[PDB]
Amino acid sequence: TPAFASWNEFFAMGGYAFFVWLAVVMTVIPLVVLVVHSVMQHRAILRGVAQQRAREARLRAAQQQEAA
Amino acid sequence: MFWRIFRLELRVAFRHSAEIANPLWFFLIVITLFPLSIGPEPQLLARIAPGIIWVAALLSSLLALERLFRDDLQDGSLEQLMLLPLPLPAVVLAKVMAHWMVTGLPLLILSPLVAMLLGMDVYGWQVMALTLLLGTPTLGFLGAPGVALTVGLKRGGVLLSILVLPLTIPLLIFATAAMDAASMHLPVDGYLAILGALLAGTATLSPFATAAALRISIQ
Amino acid sequence: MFWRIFRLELRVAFRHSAEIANPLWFFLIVITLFPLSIGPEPQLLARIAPGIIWVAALLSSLLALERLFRDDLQDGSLEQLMLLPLPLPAVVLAKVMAHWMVTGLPLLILSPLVAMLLGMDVYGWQVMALTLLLGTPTLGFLGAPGVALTVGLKRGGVLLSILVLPLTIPLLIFATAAMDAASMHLPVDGYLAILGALLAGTATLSPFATAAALRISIQ
Amino acid sequence: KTLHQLAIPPRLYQICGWFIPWLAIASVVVLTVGWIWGFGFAPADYQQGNSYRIIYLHVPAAIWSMGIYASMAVAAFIGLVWQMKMANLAVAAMAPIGAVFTFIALVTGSAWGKPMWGTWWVWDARLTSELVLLFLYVGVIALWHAFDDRRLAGRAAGILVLIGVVNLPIIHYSVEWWNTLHQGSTRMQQSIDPAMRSPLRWSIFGFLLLSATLTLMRMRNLILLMEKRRPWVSELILKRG
Amino acid sequence: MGMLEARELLCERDERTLFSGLSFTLNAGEWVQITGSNGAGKTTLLRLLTGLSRPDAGEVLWQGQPLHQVRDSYHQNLLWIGHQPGIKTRLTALENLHFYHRDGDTAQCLEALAQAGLAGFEDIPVNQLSAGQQRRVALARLWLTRATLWILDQPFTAIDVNGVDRLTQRMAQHTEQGGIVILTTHQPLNVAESKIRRISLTQ
Amino acid sequence: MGMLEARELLCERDERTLFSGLSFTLNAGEWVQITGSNGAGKTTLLRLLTGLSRPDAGEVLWQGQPLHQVRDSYHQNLLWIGHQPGIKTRLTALENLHFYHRDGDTAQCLEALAQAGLAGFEDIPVNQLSAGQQRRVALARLWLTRATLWILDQPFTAIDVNGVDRLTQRMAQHTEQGGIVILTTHQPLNVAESKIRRISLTQ
């Protein structure tokens, strides 16, 4: 059933292979970098909200110092 | 008050003349620029100058387009022009019409002069001038919402051209094809009707949404 | 504080994390815009590439040149730049060198792609970069004085526009002739040398003249 | 009903976090089987040969570029009709996904034109149209990232998307005038064999699911960015700890 | 019924809130001053009452009809002077007044400009004038208009000592015959508390 | 000998002599307030003392050296505020203040903004603020500068009374040490008359 019987000719399709694999790598790169960018920005904004909570935690600590 | 807004816009545009001279000399420098750089072989100029004149007018009017709503925000004029007893799209139409007659109209006056530097015939001049007449209001109408979206922002640069020019491509395509065919002594009335339908569509649609965009930007 | 003026001009130019792309994409707008009118045949474009890229670069520089001396007048920041404890020619040198960050080096980054889109060859790309690196700063330095004079007291009718655009004649005519003569394989070092000489001359003589121009402009 | 309570942003976050992982797993398995059954277990067309398989990596993303622009209009119109301010964030969510899909379509179309054209880029049909769509995506991205405020940016982006979807048929018909006049081109788009076409439809389905996954999770990222100090994010980060 | 009515104006915006729940009404012929805590928010309130900026929640009413429908009648009975001068810098002052309705003949000309203290400087360009008298141009607009409703944002800004007394009398003579004025200032007024109403931006 | 002195200054703008032959020497630690009567002419004189405008006649002198020669030391000891704030609208308040000297570390940062009245508004863009706050960010420079000479052109415009009181309280300490300030406001200022010296324009 497979059109390509040999595993090696799956990497060399009749001399047109390099441009096909260039299309493959320029297909993989932008989608992967988009997904990693968006997941990293989600984690970064969560960490930024955590650090923000740290800074008004210090502000309420200073308010308790002022009250005492 | 529609003609009153028209008269005020014409007077305030004509009171200074420093910023109206930049696009006209940009048009002149592009037209003077290309034939000397390309070369004096006559087989090239008759086919290349149809693109040259129209894109020169395009880039000249994109250089001119920034005056339409930018200065009125720091003068507080927009906050009173939205307050007049007249709907905002009519005022927008008046201002864009004045913007056309301050910088788009002298292109037609300069057209007999610009025809001399690059050859052509009397039929080519007539077709090119009439297509400029039918094309420059269309460009102003298509460029109005970009300026309206870019009122409140400080930016007066590449973003306006980025918003305008992809919307403005079909006018360039049809006008260049029309007058290129007119260079071949073929009748070009159908392309002229297409340009007229384009102007009718812009006049129907563009000031109706430019007012909404201007209302969004100022708030 | 020289470099601090540099960094502040860079910060008012670029605001968000991914914002540098718009000067990169506007140049592609113009580079696609010319063949939309002219044609798709791949030899005429190789013939007319110098006019293409030089008109595009002139449009970008003239579009972004306003913020040097026009915006800072109304906000009043220009006055406390004038009273900053540093000589004014160094200040205007910093400001124009920050202006070169907007148009020149994005153009140098995008030169291979627009060379590939316009055909040409590897020698065309090499001479293309070597003339762009010398042509953008002299364009900014030569566009600075006319903008400096046009900021002056608002009475001047028509004569001030001759100081800003028609000074580009020797620069652009020398550059386009060199880039056209680079199409057919010929020695082109004698034109790059005079372009570099013009660059050195205008870089020496521009800020000291524009300092007195800004002194005259606001009185 | 549930459509009225869909607009509350913590509830939108919760339903989005419900939808993301199963949607991503379905997307990746459908895209995996589509790519496997496309690149393998299929012969090539007679004329161009083994390069014909690039018609996979070119076709759905390109049309879904068009598709996602239509979806953006479906957002933007709503964002002007009832002033549903939640609908404007979907425009900024869907814009760079469309930009990436248009870029990948342009790259595959340029790379596959080599065996006949010779030059990497020849100013033929469908590629000018993809370039114009990419330019419109650049305009929407610039207008979103240009405003200092978010709500005005979203509504201005909706206005720009409405103007673009109004003017887009004119561009798509006027660029075709370069294909009747000014020489001709070959049938590069959908010159297909009728017996073996199901992997292409499964690839259409696979991007659709991937585009939905990316636009939902980016809409989640924007709904975190927008509601910075409101206490539901506070309860979220407290539940984290 | 009141001429200008407010209903639950919510203007929480830009990751903060400004005010909540104001429902103030004005009948014919009143004087009101918005209270002062910060620089603005009062300015945003005045922009909400004039119809330039849309409310987030709640609405305003003019003669019992919402403002998105009665735009013509509202625009025929209002003028706006804010922080912006509202004049074109390039043009001269006389035609800056002449753009607005009437002016023209001397029954509405040269005393609209004279009574605001800008006599002798009519045909001078605006760019060679002080910013205080640039604002006095927009204050001089008040003498030649017949709008029943005035909404003024900072009239007493860079204004000379005599200008305050010159302005307050004219706003009073507007105030008796059913002229509703909505004022924002920072300078104190030499006006008794009884005849002026106070609507406060509550917290 | 005083630090800043003025000799036979002449100003002429469009056939009107704004001021002619005014001369005044300023000793160290003084609170000169120019009064004036017209809107413009005080602004031009304050502008010309700083060296923006070359005098038509006469000269302004600084430790015996005129302003066209000793610029590099004259600009190192001056703080100027005009009708326009001189700030950049798009940038934040913190970066706009950090452009000028020092700021940075907390010994010179975040209390200069706080004592002006701008606590909790440090990171917000200047465009998204009040015009009173857009000038308050410019008035906040006084707490961190090392300039002996200050010339302020209408400082108390649309700043609340608490801000005015805190400003003048800061001005008192600069008056006690060696430092000359020239201010011009229409509002009366609430301090003893004996400490303020009036240099009024005469004709």
CA distances from E17 to D8, D84, E9, E43 (A): 18, 20, 12, 14
- Token look-up 């700083």 returns F50
Q: Could you give the CA distance from residue F51 to residue F73 in angstroms, rounded to a whole number?
A: 13
**CA torsion angle for F158, F163, F168, F170 (degrees, to 10)?**
-130
Q: Could you give the CA distance from residue C37 to residue B172 in angstroms, rounded to a whole number?
A: 7
Chains contacting chain E through 3 or more C-beta pairs under 8 A: B, C, D, F
Alpha helices in D6-144 (DSSP H): 9-39, 54-81, 86-112, 114-117, 127-144
Q: Which residues contact C177 (CB under 8 A, 6 or more apart)?
A: B37, C191
Q: How far is CA E91 from the centre of its chain?
A: 23
Q: Is the sign of the CA dihedral B203, B26, B191, D122 positive or negative? A: negative
Q: Nearest to residue E152, comparing CAs of E93, E198, E86?
A: E86
H-helix or E-strand spanning residue E46: helix E42-50
Q: Partners of E153 in the beta sheet?
A: E184
Check if the beta carbon of residue E80 is closer than 8 Å to that of residue E145.
no
User: What amino acid is encoded at B21 in this protein?
Assistant: A
- Residue of C67, C80, C153 to mutate when probing chain F, most F C-beta within 10 A: C80
User: What amino acid is encoded at E158 in this protein?
Assistant: A
Which residues of chain E lie closer than 8 angstroms to F156, CB-CB? none
Q: Nearest to residue F169, comparing CAs of F141, F191, F201, F199?
A: F191
- The structure tokens listed for C65 are 């040149």
Q: Partners of E34 in the beta sheet?
A: E199
Q: Could you give the CA distance from residue F161 to residue F146 in angstroms, rounded to a whole number?
A: 26
Q: Could you give the CA distance from residue E172 to residue E190 in angstroms, rounded to a whole number?
A: 12
Interface contact B82, partner E, CB < 8 A? yes
Exposure letters D57-73 (e unless 16+ CB within 10 A, then b): bbbbbbbbbbbbbebbb
What is the greatest pairwise CA distance in chain F? 52
For residue D121, the distance in angstroms to the closest alpha carbon of chain C comes to 6
- Token look-up 């807004």 returns B5
CA angle, A6 then A10 then A11, to 5°: 125
- The structure tokens listed for D204 are 């259409």
Count how many pairs of residues, chain C against chain D, have C-beta atoms within 8 Å.
Answer: 30
The residues spanned by each domain of chain F are 1-203
Interface contact B185, partner E, CB < 8 A? no
Using CB atoms within 10 A of its CB, is residue A60 exposed (0-12), middle (13-18) or buried (19+)?
Answer: exposed
- In what side-by-side order are the strands of the sheet with F31-33? F78-81, F149-153, F180-184, F31-33, F196-198
Interface contact F12, partner C, CB < 8 A? no
Q: Could you give the CA distance from residue D103 to residue D94 in angstroms, rounded to a whole number?
A: 14
Residue E43 annotated as binding site: yes
For residue E14, the distance in angstroms to the closest alpha carbon of chain D comes to 8
Q: How far is CA E189 from the centre of its chain?
A: 16
Structural resolution in Å:
3.9
Q: Could you give the CA distance from residue F130 to residue E44 in angstroms, rounded to a whole number?
A: 10
- The structure tokens listed for C83 are 């009273």
Of F50, F76, F86, the CB nearest to C76: F86
Check if the beta carbon of residue E81 is closer than 8 Å to that of residue E155.
yes
Q: Could you give the CA distance from residue D26 to residue F23 in angstroms, rounded to a whole number?
A: 86
Q: Could you give the CA distance from residue E1 to residue E3 in angstroms, rounded to a whole number?
A: 7
- Token look-up 């109206």 returns B20
Q: How far is CA F172 from the centre of its chain?
A: 14
Crossing angle of helices E131-140 and E161-176, rounded to 10°: 20
- CA neighbours closer than 13 Å in the CB half-sphere of residue F110: 6
For residue D123, the distance in angstroms to the closest alpha carbon of chain C comes to 6
Q: How many Cβ atoms are within 10 Å of E139's Cβ, its own excluded?
A: 23
Q: Could you give the CA distance from residue F6 to residue F59 in angstroms, rounded to a whole number?
A: 6
Residue F40 annotated as binding site: yes
Could C29 and B176 be called an inter-chain contact, meaning their C-beta atoms sit closer than 8 Å?
A: no
Q: Could you give the CA distance from residue D94 to residue F74 in angstroms, rounded to a whole number?
A: 56
For residue A66, the distance in angstroms to the closest alpha carbon of chain D comes to 24
Residue spans of beta strands (DSSP E) within C42-127:
none
Regarding chains E and A, contact by 3 or more CB pairs under 8 A is answered as no
Q: Nearest to residue B35, comparing CAs of B111, B119, B132?
A: B119
DSSP string, E158-193: S--HHHHHHHHHHHHHHHHTT-EEEEE-SS--SS-S
Regarding chains E and F, contact by 3 or more CB pairs under 8 A is answered as yes
Q: Is the sign of the CA dihedral D1, D7, D10, D11 positive or negative? A: positive
- CA neighbours closer than 13 Å in the CB half-sphere of residue F92: 12
Q: Is the sign of the CA dihedral F183, F188, F194, F198 positive or negative? A: positive
Could D147 and B159 be called an inter-chain contact, meaning their C-beta atoms sit closer than 8 Å?
A: no
- Token look-up 């009397």 returns B122
Q: Find, in chain D, the residue whose alpha carbon is nearest to that of C14.
A: D146
**CA torsion angle for C140, C142, C144, C145 (degrees, to 10)?**
180
Q: Could you give the CA distance from residue A46 to residue D65 in angstroms, rounded to a whole number?
A: 31
Q: Could you give the CA distance from residue F163 to residue F159 in angstroms, rounded to a whole number?
A: 6
Q: Could you give the CA distance from residue D148 to residue F83 in angstroms, rounded to a whole number?
A: 26
Q: Could you give the CA distance from residue B130 to residue B139 in angstroms, rounded to a whole number?
A: 15
Check if the beta carbon of residue F155 is closer than 8 Å to that of residue F126.
no
Using CB atoms within 10 A of its CB, is residue E41 exposed (0-12), middle (13-18) or buried (19+)?
Answer: middle
Q: Nearest to residue D11, comparing CAs of D241, D218, D221, D220?
A: D220
Exposure letters D108-142 (e unless 16+ CB within 10 A, then b): bbbbbbbeebeeebebbbbbbbbbbbbbbbbbbbb
Q: Is the sign of the CA dihedral F143, F144, F150, F156 positive or negative? A: negative
Phi, psi (deg, nearest 5) at residue F32:
-60, 130
Using CB atoms within 10 A of its CB, is residue F203 exposed (0-12), middle (13-18) or buried (19+)?
Answer: exposed
Check if the beta carbon of residue F21 is closer than 8 Å to that of residue F58.
yes
**CA torsion angle for B142, B144, B148, B150 (degrees, to 10)?**
70
DSSP structural state of residue B104: I
Q: Find, in chain D, the residue whose alpha carbon is nearest to that of F91.
A: D148
Phi, psi (deg, nearest 5) at residue F8:
45, 45
- Token look-up 């087989």 returns B43
Q: Partners of F92 in the beta sheet?
A: F125
Check if the beta carbon of residue D133 is closer than 8 Å to that of residue D127.
no
What is the greatest pairwise CA distance in chain D? 66
Phi, psi (deg, nearest 5) at residue F64:
85, 0
Q: How far is CA D188 from the centre of its chain?
A: 21
DSSP structural state of residue A58: H
Beta strand pairing status for E25-26 and E4-10? antiparallel
Check if the beta carbon of residue B178 is closer than 8 Å to that of residue B198.
no
Q: Could you give the CA distance from residue D141 to residue D154 in angstroms, rounded to a whole number?
A: 11
Could C77 and F86 be called an inter-chain contact, meaning their C-beta atoms sit closer than 8 Å?
A: yes
Reduced to 3 states (helix: H, G, I; strand: E, B; else coil), residue F101 is: coil
User: What amino acid is encoded at B25 in this protein?
Assistant: W
Could E15 and D149 be called an inter-chain contact, meaning their C-beta atoms sit closer than 8 Å?
A: no
Could F52 and C79 be called an inter-chain contact, meaning their C-beta atoms sit closer than 8 Å?
A: yes
Check if the beta carbon of residue C84 is closer than 8 Å to that of residue C8.
no
Phi, psi (deg, nearest 5) at residue D118:
90, -60
Of B4, B83, B85, the CB nearest to E80: B83
Reduced to 3 states (helix: H, G, I; strand: E, B; else coil), residue D98 is: helix
Q: Which residues contact E65 (CB under 8 A, 6 or more apart)?
A: none
CA distances from C86 to C80, C141, F75 (A): 11, 20, 8
- The structure tokens listed for D100 are 């990436």
- Token look-up 């005010």 returns E19
